[PDB]
Structure 1
Amino acid sequence: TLEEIIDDDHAIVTSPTMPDYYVSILSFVDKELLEPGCSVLLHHKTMSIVGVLQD
């Protein structure tokens, strides 16, 4: 769940499993398609916002 968006192409995402992360924003997403509250799709090995094609 996108907790707050930091303007530098980084974001603080809240996995519901509890550790928060200063992730990077990669390809196949736009930063005005992310709004606080939006769900994000995270890369498992190094956390990154890889998208949200979700309904």
Structure 2
Amino acid sequence: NPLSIGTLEEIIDDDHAIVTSPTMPDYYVSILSFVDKELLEPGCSVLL
């Protein structure tokens, strides 16, 4: 806790993604733990 809301701009197929948060700072996050990458794809709001 807290799970920080981001907005997913685009995915990369190496288990990572580039989020731009509404709080400013972009982050090169990893898609790891309890996630399908088929429920990801532009426009998603994510738990970081």
TM-score by length of 2: 0.79
2:40 corresponds in structure 1 to: 34
**Alignment partner of 1:10 is 2:23:** no
> How many Å separate the matches in 2 of 1:7 and 1:19?
22
Counting aligned pairs with the same residue, the percent is 100
TM-score by length of 1: 0.70
Give 1:14 shift.
1.0
Q: Once the two structures are superposed, what CA deviation does each residue of 1:1-55 show, in whole Å capped at 9, x if it has no partner?
A: 101101100000111011111111111111110111111100xxxxxxxxxxxxx
User: Which structure 1 segments of 5+ residues have no match?
Assistant: 43-55
Structure possessing the higher relative contact order (Cα contacts under 8 Å, 6 or more residues apart): 2
Over 6 Å off, 4+ runs:
none
* Alignment RMSD: 0.7
Structure 2, unmatched stretches of 5+, are: 1-6
